[PDB]
Structures are given as C-alpha cells and as structure tokens.
Amino acid sequence: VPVSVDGETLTVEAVRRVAEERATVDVPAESIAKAQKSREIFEGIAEQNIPIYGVTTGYGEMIYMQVDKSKEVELQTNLVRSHSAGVGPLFAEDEARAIVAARLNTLAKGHSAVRPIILERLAQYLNEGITPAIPEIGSLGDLAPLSHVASTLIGEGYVLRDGRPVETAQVLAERGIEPLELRFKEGLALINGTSGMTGLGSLVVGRALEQAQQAEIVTALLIEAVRGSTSPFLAEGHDIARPHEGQIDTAANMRALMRGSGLTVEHADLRRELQKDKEAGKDVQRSEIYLQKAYSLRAIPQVVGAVRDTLYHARHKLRIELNSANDNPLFFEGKEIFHGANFHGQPIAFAMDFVTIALTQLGVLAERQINRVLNRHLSYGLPEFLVSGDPGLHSGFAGAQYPATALVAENRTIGPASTQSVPSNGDNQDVVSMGLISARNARRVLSNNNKILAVEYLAAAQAVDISGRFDGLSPAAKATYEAVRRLVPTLGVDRYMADDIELVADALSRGEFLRAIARETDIQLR
Amino acid sequence: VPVSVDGETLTVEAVRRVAEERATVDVPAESIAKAQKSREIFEGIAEQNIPIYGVTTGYGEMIYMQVDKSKEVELQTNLVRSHSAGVGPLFAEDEARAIVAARLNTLAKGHSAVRPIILERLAQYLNEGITPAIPEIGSLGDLAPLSHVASTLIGEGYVLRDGRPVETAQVLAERGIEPLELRFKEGLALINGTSGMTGLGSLVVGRALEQAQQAEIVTALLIEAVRGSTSPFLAEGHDIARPHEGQIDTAANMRALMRGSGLTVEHADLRRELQKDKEAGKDVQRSEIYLQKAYSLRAIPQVVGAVRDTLYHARHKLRIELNSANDNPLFFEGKEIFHGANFHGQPIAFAMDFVTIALTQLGVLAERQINRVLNRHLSYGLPEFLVSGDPGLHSGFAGAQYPATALVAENRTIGPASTQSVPSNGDNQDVVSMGLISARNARRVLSNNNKILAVEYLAAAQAVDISGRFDGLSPAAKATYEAVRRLVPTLGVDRYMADDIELVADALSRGEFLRAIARETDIQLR
Amino acid sequence: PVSVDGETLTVEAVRRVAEERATVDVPAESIAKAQKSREIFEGIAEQNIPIYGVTTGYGEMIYMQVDKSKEVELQTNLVRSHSAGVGPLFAEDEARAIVAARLNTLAKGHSAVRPIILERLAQYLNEGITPAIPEIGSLGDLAPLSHVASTLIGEGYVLRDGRPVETAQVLAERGIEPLELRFKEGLALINGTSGMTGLGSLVVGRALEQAQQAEIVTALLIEAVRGSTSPFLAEGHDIARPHEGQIDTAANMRALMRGSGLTVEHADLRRELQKDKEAGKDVQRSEIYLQKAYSLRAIPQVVGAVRDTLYHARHKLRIELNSANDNPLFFEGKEIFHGANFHGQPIAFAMDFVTIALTQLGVLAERQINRVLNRHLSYGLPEFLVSGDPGLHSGFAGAQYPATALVAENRTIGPASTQSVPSNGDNQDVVSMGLISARNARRVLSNNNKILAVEYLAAAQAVDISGRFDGLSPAAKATYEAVRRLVPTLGVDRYMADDIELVADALSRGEFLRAIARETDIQLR
C-alpha cells in the first residue's frame, strides 16, 4: 500500500501482500530509468545483428541456429507460443499473482534489457486484477508456467477469472488495454527465470512461519489443559545451553504464551510434590507423579526450533532470489553480455525441499500431541478419547484422530524433487532443479498440516471444558479457546465431525488464531 | 446391464461399468436369501445381550466398554457420526460409485449379518444416481470414507451432485426415499472394510491396463515412423527364451499392431544392408547403420511386460478382495462369531503401491521415446525437435517435451504408503496399511502418464507427416495417426501447445485410441 | 593442540582430532567450572530430592523413585542395559569424532559431571583407545553413546586394529584403572546428540572438500573441452545473484581456470560465430555454440546451492558442538533445568539436507561425465574417449556405468529426520533419527568420490587424447599430473576397477585440492 518492486528490496511479506491482500505495486522512477537506458543501449547492440543468445539465435539446443534481427518479433513470439505447454491444475489467484510479482521484480532490477513498457504492463495486470491462468505442471526449474503468463501480455493464452480460464484477448478488450508486441529479448526475459517457484515458495514460507506460530499457540493451550511443567521453556536451557536461533525463539513464544497461567506447574512444585509423596515408601518406590512429561510436551523448543531454523534459511534464500536477475543472458553497462545460468532454480529448489521436510516433522509433533490427549493412559486424567458422556456408547474424538494420523503418513510419501533431474532438450538441459515441484510439495504438506492442527485445536478446547479448567487458562489460552469455540461447539454427544474440522482448518489457513492473540493479548510472537 | 453383485463373481471390469458407465446393479435372490436368514439368526444372538464386538461393546480401544442391547441403534448411529471425519477433496462420481459397489458386494456375500434392506438401499443409490460425497483423506486402511457413505444411508452427511456436496436429507425427500435406521452391527459393517481402496483401485488398475495398451499403440506408431527393426518382437525371444506372461503379451500386441507395415525393417534386411555397406572398409570400419536400436525402441516387451505382470497381480488381488467379507466381526452358520481383522487393507495396500511403481516406469519409457524423436542425433534423420520449417526461428516440440520430462520427476517423488503405518487409537491400531493413500498415489501416476503419452502421440503423428511416411504406415498405425489428427492439426509454425496436449490426454483417459483400433482394424489387443 | 572447552570447538577442529590424531586438552577454566558445578550439584543429590536420571527411573520409568543409596547401581544398570547397538562398528575416526563431541559437551559445564569424566575421555583420545561403537540403535544417540560409556567403566568393547576387544584387557594392558559412575554421570555420558553431531562434523567437513574437488575437476574438464568463461564472471553472481555459495563457486571457478590457453572469452566466441555467418535476412545453421550446456555453464548455481546447504549445516554443527546437549541441566542458583536438549532434530534436519545437496552434486558430476563421453556432446573428442580403434575398443564406455548407477542409488536414500516412531511406552513419542540422517549423508558422500573418480580419469584421458596438455592453466596441469601420478593414460582398454577405486580413495584423502594448494598457492573457498 503500495509495495515497491525495485528489484532490490522486495520481501516475502511484501510479495504476500501483493498476492493475498491485493496490495498496489509500484515500480520506482529510478528503476524505470535504469530500464529505459538499458533498453536503449542494448537496442543499439542488437541492432548490429551481433550474436546474442535468444535474441539473434535459436533457443536451448538450437542456439547453433543464427537468426537475423529482421526476425526480432517473430523470434520472441514463437518462443512464448511453443513453450506455453503447461498442463494440470491452474494456480489460484494469490499464487499466480506472487509469480507475476516475482517476475516483475526480477526485470525491474535492470539487468534484463526489457522496455519499461513490460514492467509497466505487468504492474498494470497486478494493480488492475488481470490474473494469468498459470498451469501448475511443466517447469524443470520455470519455462512453461512463465510462458503461459507471457502469453496474456500479448493478448494470447488465458486469464483466470472466477476460477475458470478465459481467452485473454477478450478480457483485454473488455478493459480497454491493447496487447503488447514482444521485441528483442522480451519474450525470453519474461519466461527464463525462477519466478514460478520463487513466487509460490514465498507464499508457502510466509505461511509456514505462521503455521509454526499457530502450532506454538495450540501447544501452549494443550500444555495448560494437561497442566504440564514450564521448566522445558526456561530461557537458560536455550539462550545459554543450546543457542539455536529458532530454538530460542520458540522457547520465548512459549513463555509469553503461557505467562499468567494458573494451570501450569513449575519444576520446583513438581519435585516437592514427589518429595512429600515419597514420604516413606522404601528405597525404590513406584509413584504416580511425573517429574517430566513426554517428549511431545517437553521437546517443543528443539523440534519446532529446528523447523524455524529451516524456515528462516528458506526465507533468506527467497529474499536474495526475489531481488536477483533470474534471467539470461544479462546486460550490464560497459561489459560484454553475460551468458550464464541464473535461471537455474537449484538454490530455491533445495530450500523448498527442506521446507517440506521441516513441515512434515512439525505435523508429526502435532499428531503425537493429539494422540497424547486422546489416550487415557497418557492424557493425565482425561476421559478416554475426550468422551464427555458414556464412553463406548460414544467415541468422542476417536474417529477424528484418524484423518490426522493418516495425514502424517501421506506427508511422509512426498520425496525431495530438487535431486530428480532428467536430461532434456537434446541433452542441453542435462541438469535441472525441479524447484516448482519442490515448492508445490511444500505447499501440500503446509495445507495438510492445517488439517492436523485443526484436529488439535478442537481436541484442546474439548480437553479444556471436559476437565473444567477454563478459569485457570492464561489470557492467551482463553483467547485461543474462545476462537475455537466461536467456530465449533463443545462436543456433547457424538456428531458429524468433517465440517467442524474443515472449519478450523480454514480458520488456520488464514491466520485466525494468530489474529485472536494479537487483538486479545499484549503478546508479540516471534 | 445388469451387473450381479453376489459377493462371489464381481470383476474389476464389472465394477468399472457400474462406476463409469452407470451399469445397473442387481443383488441375486440367493444372496438376499442368505442375508435374510443370517440376519434372523444373528438377531437371535444379539437379542441375548451376548458380547459381540461393535454390537454390544464400544469400538476400537473402547471394546472394553459393554453396551446393553437396549442401545442397539444409538450404538451404531454414534459410530457413523463420530467417524465421519474425512477431509480434503471429494471423490468424483465414478470413484464414489466404485467404492459403494465394492461395499455392497462385500455385504451381499452374506457373512456380515446385514438386513436385506441395506443391500437393497445401497443398490438403490447406485441404480438411481444417488452419489455420496466421499472425502478422499481420512482412512488408515477405510473408516472415515465409508462413514461418510454410511451417513447418506441414514439421511445424513452429503451427496455429491454436480460436483458440490448437498445435504443428503434434502435429496432423499426430493426423491421420495425414506432414510434407514441403523440396527445391530449395520453401521459397523458399512464402514469396517477395504471398499474405499478396493473400489478406487479397481478403476485405477482397469485403466492401468488400458494405459499399457495405448502405450503399446503409440510405441508401435513411433517404431513405424522411425522405421525400426521388428526383430525385438519375434515370438521366439519371449514365448521360448523368457516366458514372462506380460512380456509375451506385449510382444504379441506389438506384432499385431505392426502387421502390414511397409516402413518397418527386418533384421535380415538390416544385416544385408550392413554387409553390402562394409563393401571394403578395412577391418574395423565406422558405419551409419544400426543393426539394433536403442533400448527405448527394443526393450519394450521386457519393460512394458513387467508392468503388465505387476498389473495382472494387482487385478488378481482385487478380484479376490472384491468378493471377500471385508468386515468384522463375521457371521457363519453353526459357528462362533469370527473376531478377526479382515478389514485390514494390507493385501491391496501392497498391490496399489506396486502399481504406482510399475506405472512410474511405464512413463519413464514413454518419456525417453519422446526424447528419442526430438533429438536429431537419435531420431534417425528427423529434423531437430520435429520442426517442419526453419529451426531456431521455430522450436517445434522443444517446449512440449518439458511437461513430459517434469512429470517423470514428479511421479518419482511419490513413495510407497503401505509401509507408513502410524499407531493410533490408544495403540489399538498399532499396524495399518494406508491402502487408500496407495491407491490414490497410483491414480496420480496414472493420470500423469496420460499427459506424458499425449505428448508422445502428438510427436509421433508430427513425426509421420514431417517424414512424409503416412502411406507406409500399417493399418493400425494409420488408425492411430488419424485419431490424433482428428483432434489436433499437424504442427506448422509454432503455436500454443497447452490445449493440444490436454486434448489428447483427455482422449487417452477415455480409451479413444484403444477404440480407434477396435473399429478400424481387426486387431484384438491383449 | 585442540582446545575442548565446550565453547569454541569447530567442525574442522573435530576432524583434526579424529583423522589426524590431533591432541586434545580441556582448559583449566572448563575443568574448573566442572568440579564447581559438580560441587553444588552433589549437594543437591545428597538431600535425596527428585532429579531425573539421578534419583528417578529412566524414560517412561521416571515415575520410579530411587533413593541416593543406589547412586552407582543406577548409572551402571542404565549404561549396560542401553548398550544395545547393532550393525557395523563405526570407523576409528568416526568413533573418535563422537567421543570428542561428548567431551566438548560435558566441558560446557552444565552437566554437573565429576571432572575425571572429562579427564578420562580426553585420555582415551590422547592415547589411542577407541571405543567399538555399533552404528545402529540410536533414535537421535543413547545406544551408540552407551557403548562409549561402557569402555569408561572398563566394560563393553574397544576398537583394536579393526576388531572389538574386551575393554577389560586393553585397560589393564595399558595401565589404566576403570571408573565408577557416580550421580548423573552415566546419564550425562549417553544423553545427547554426540553420535550424529560427531559423525555429521566429519561428513560436513568432507562434503565441503568434495565441493572443492568437484570444482577442481570441473574446471579441468571445462578447459579440456574449450568452454566459455562467461558463465563465471563476477557480475553474474556478485552483482546479479548474491547467493553466498554461488559467489564462492564462481570465484573458485575463475581462480582454477585462471591463465588457461584452451578457454574462450565470450567476446572471442561472438566474433568467431559472427564471422561464420552469411548475410541476407535469414536464419543460418552454425556449428559453433555461443553457450555451452548446463553441466558446463550452470556450475555456480548448482554447486553454490550445495555450498549454501553445507554452510548452514556447518553452522548448526558449530552451535550444537558447543552446546550442553545433555539433560537435566545445572546452573547458578537456578532450579535443575528439565528440558530436551538431547533432541537431535536440529542436526537431523541439517544432515538430511546435506544428503539431498550432495546427491545433486553427484547428479551434476555424472552428467558432465556423460557430456565428455558422448561424441555428439563432447565438442570434438572421440566417442567414449577411445585412443585406438573404437568398437574394437570401448574406452571409458564401461567406466560410465558405475557413475550412472550411483546417482540412482543416492536417489533411493530418503530423509530420516521425519520417520520418527514412538517408543519407550509413549514417553519418546517424537524423535529425530538424526544418526540415520548423518549416515545417509556419509553414504552419498562416499558414493560421490566414486562418481568423481570416474570424472577425474575421464578428464585426464580427454586431455592427452585431444593433445591440449600445454594449453592447460597452472591449476589444470596440477590436477592432471595428480591423476597420472596415480593412473596412466588409457591406450587399449583394460581392467578399470582398480584405477577408479584408486582415484576415489585419493579423493577421499584430499589428494587433489592438496595439489592445487601446493602447486599453485590458489586459495579455494
């Protein structure tokens, strides 16, 4: 409001605002200036029929084919058409916008020799709601996807409005816009980069962090519902003993989340309760008190911490990628044309595969915490499967655990894609990254975690009123509880659960519980 | 027309007719008789408040909870409600019908103690177009999915008409049907089985074989377009040398497919051409003739053969499963109630994971054959990337290869699910199969292969007119070619390919090319 | 002398102690705040108050209370009953890297272990008494460490010239008196991530050298095939795509190829190709390539990405090494901290990512091999680099297979940090499987030396088969001589297995990299 795509300072969060919240995009004057001057100089060199990859030569393997400058526009135009071969589902609006935003930023950096008109047109599509119908499958890491985008820039292909693809040509006339004509290198620079995987992966990682937070939120509530120890989160054990950035953060968010609880216990109270309970048992005596709780309720900082570490690394790679010249060849001033491979998404390809893994484990932990409260032998006194009435006759959450358990297994069948290169194009592309497959894998696990966490939020809230511990909950926990209960009623007798779960899962995919804390508490989560 | 669901002779093909072609289902009189008598006897035992799993006891872990027969209907009813917790996408109509058909057949076998009314109602939904809105995710292998189905049987849950879920209750009134009331063991028997994975997997495997066939079809065309040797398919090398059932079949389908070709060559001609070409070169001389062709055009029987073997094994397991009492506990006559685990989908869980693998390789082969014709160094004289005009200025199929290459990598990231058991329900379900995850994995690779093969059919047909070899094609090849060309025009100048590919892929998902051969030739493919 | 102070231990330091038998010393400070911590702590144990592992049961058995009068029995029963490692025994250097990691941990000072524990550990390392540690058993590292903790109390087995021998004889046979485990000593010895952190350290240190050796031969090959330098120019990375790793690889590629007579500047190519074009307003077919294939052009991007992953891993390992990954923990007038710093999730992720990264590194090396062996892609060289009559001779045609096979095998290795399975009742309901993660990485690294070994040979072969040895820059000749000094050129074809394994063992020793450093002074990042 409005975001500045200068190819230098764009952030993941900024990309999400443009994509999700329809924030206005704006290409700075100094950027348009850099572009204009670059175009003029580059035009003077192309005008001399000099050999320049994809400007005066065929593409990929057919680079050995020389094309005369008299075929300037045809060259770039056949490229986009013949490469618009994406298949499969179409990306949602917010996803397609992130990809376009990422492209625009790439070009706006100034090392692509694109006419300002292109930067202008892209931003116009974003600012005016013209969303390309981008097919998800095709890139080897992102020709196909970007080619489909590039098509709408010239009045071709399809734009995705209302979820269905509509012939771009028509929508443009229905808006007064006049199709562009691709000039020297412009079709190439529009598709020869990592904007597909970088745009989608930004959204994924931004939410991933939000999912880490909401994961911390529910976990805090559960700990308060089952009255666990707060010892595991004492700052000394992390800030001093094992200083892993993410571990330190999660520990801090946990302490803030539970500040003000009357339900949680402190190690000092735990041991005293044991000391007085071992009043005169013998030498070796079996107690009922647990000086410590299971890993699922004590190793949260280590596990969720590592997830964060992975998440921070990915955001850092994305930050650098968003503001890079994901293109080839590249123009600089007073230098020869750079002929390299900055279109290779390996860096992001690796990042997103790691996210997949990290999120998969984040879901593993959630799953076990669910199992934790549903198993009477581990819930610390809660009725079996949170049944509030007559067990047996009622299963309570018994069935609701399955979709969560099945999801942990499903996320585990998704393998790394960044290592699955297959040589194509006459062996010219002997090594690729498949980065867009990696990002989608991550999007899938992310989406799946929402369902798992949803079952967790419902269980916690249910655990709270069954034990009748609502008055003891901390402020944050009461916020979390009310947010859940405002959507789904407490479980009396057994009832259809599918809708309840899918309802909280949607609340989760839009940061609801993260909002509840922001407007109900003074807590500032990392 | 009409299929007989007797729980004894149902076939995969029969299941597909009910699902895909809306074939009428019919439960034989002897089956209804077996049911009625079973119900009467079982009712007399339940009536004696005797302990029977899920009839007079709680479910899963809560089996230790005893329920009085006075809670007959509530017991079964809470079960279905509380277990209707599926999440994610809803299965298509044909998929949901296969699952219901599989359930009905299970019960109709007679060892489930269900009232004939249930068999009657299920068949009524199938015969009258009442399709349940079954969520894809939830089963640990298939409670959730079947529970969602069971809901519509009692006027609850949702039915999927027009792709959207609509409150069952309403649709029933809009049809005059009156909701059933679940009696002793009826809610349990409706959800306690493998019908989810068995119904979906039947469709998958049936098509899988069709995909193997259409894979053989395109391969035959390609071999004829590039004039390869027919030697690799001589019956002696398989029927005698390496008698693998599927290998023998593929070899036979290849010989029939190419019978009548003028373009293919025979080893006897190949060597003579070499003998006369080595006219006086020296001792060691470099020729341009290849006595043999690459694996992609010579090992088709071995590779596609193994795929078939795997496919036949899966169909055989499914055949046995479809006609089994996927339920628990089970009733027999003059015996104690059987209390086991025939609900465990491991057998099918394993089968579908193998299908995933086998199909993945089937796509690997297709991919390489594509690469084969697009690479001028391997296409045997074809213009680079099948460009018919000025290469470089035109890329031809250059871009169209990517979605196919990317798909091979995507299918490779799908790992086995049958081994991903996670213990749930208070450790009562310590070992499960995840069979429905396995079947969906297989459905995904199947769906993906269609796209890969589509790119292959377009390339072959393009390869045919570019070389101008249409008059030499065998009858089957001309059939295949015309079927392709009837959908997509020959590639002149470069153009948007996305629609072309997606068009042939759809033709492929409905057996078009398999039909073209059936109405244009006298060929009977195995 | 490597200073094991639980504060500054480095990955490279760990290697020196493990591979080069570097001597270790525990600083007076560390050994001081050890006895002290031990002092206050011991004053807590006396009062017989609840303290996990010290006066309680283990894992899910924490409900069982244990009176102080069982101080030695507790620690001993623990270590002996958890010594259940199976499978192969870690190698001497591996077993060593683990021990060092555990010491550094207890030298941090918050484990409250008697100083002789840190002392005796250092002695084992300083005297060559290596524990026989089996590789399997850890859920991420009780068992692996339980075997280490045994040798300390004169039990289990030590590793002598390859085989496991009773710690009993070896100790008596060396004039050492076994120890007696006191309060919390047994638990502290086995309650951490020392196996995975230790092994991971060796793996990451070597991974980085592999990235360096991948670049070396890559440069050789790019030279032997007359590739373009355009792809590595600083503007394309330092300016256009600031990824640390990418920049580093580009720099090394410029340094390695520095002063070559076979390489071509883009300007020259442009002028070369242009000169080869007729006029009109048409499209021409040329035999020149303005750009070379990805395997010879996208090295900075791919290898740089690998480096970024290796850098992040070293980072996590450095933090973990100098961390108190033990439990419970002790502090100054603070309640006894009861957490889970024994959870290897952080390193489990790091190593899983390394496995992935190294696998791509191998994919790239392999495709370059394919690149040079295929006459349609080698840019001139003879098919499969045959010197004499092809067909009659296969050349390197046969050597390519194990290379292509390894890429496939590496791809069958999946992430382990996510395959947690609940055990110990349900007390350990979420674990990391980090030591499996480290071992997956160890395997891919090992397989990459084989893939590279083929590449190094192919490179030398292509050099003296095209006759460009005099055009090779200083670094290139160094690499070349390095190979010939081990394997001669290939005239007629012969048994390849020995040459390959020879160049592979050499690679795992740093024979190359060492050569560029000696014969060139070039400082590779």
Swiss-Prot record, chain C:
Question: PROSITE patterns, per this entry?
Answer: PAL_HISTIDASE
Q: Where is the active site?
A: Y52
This enzyme catalyses: L-tyrosine = 3-amino-3-(4-hydroxyphenyl)propanoate; L-tyrosine = (E)-4-coumarate + NH4(+)
Q: Where does substrate bind?
A: H82, N191, R297
SUPFAM superfamilies given in the database record: L-aspartase-like (SSF48557)
Q: Which GO terms describe its biological process?
A: antibiotic biosynthetic process; toxin biosynthetic process
| Molecular functions (GO terms) | L-tyrosine 2,3-aminomutase activity; tyrosine ammonia-lyase activity
What Pfam families does the database record attribute to this sequence? Lyase_aromatic
Which Gene3D superfamilies would you find in this protein's record?
Answer: Fumarase/aspartase (Central domain) (1.20.200.10), Fumarase/aspartase (N-terminal domain) (1.10.275.10)
Q: Known post-translational modifications? A: Contains an active site 4-methylidene-imidazol-5-one (MIO), which is formed autocatalytically by cyclization and dehydration of residues Ala-Ser-Gly.
- What does the UniProt entry list as the effect of changing E60A? Despite a decrease in activity, it shows lyase activity over time and still produced some amount of beta-tyrosine
Enzyme Commission number(s) of this protein:
5.4.3.6, 4.3.1.23
Q: Which UniProt keywords apply?
A: Antibiotic biosynthesis, Isomerase, Lyase
Give the consequence of mutating Y289A. Despite a decrease in activity, it shows lyase activity over time and still produced some amount of beta-tyrosine
**PANTHER family annotated for this entry?**
HISTIDINE AMMONIA-LYASE (PTHR10362)
**Into which family does the record put it?**
Belongs to the TAL/TAM family.
Can you state the subunit structure given in the record? Homotetramer; dimer of dimers.
Function, as annotated: Catalyzes the MIO-dependent deamination of L-tyrosine generating the corresponding alpha,beta-unsaturated acid, (S)-beta-tyrosine.
Which named protein is this? MIO-dependent tyrosine 2,3-aminomutase
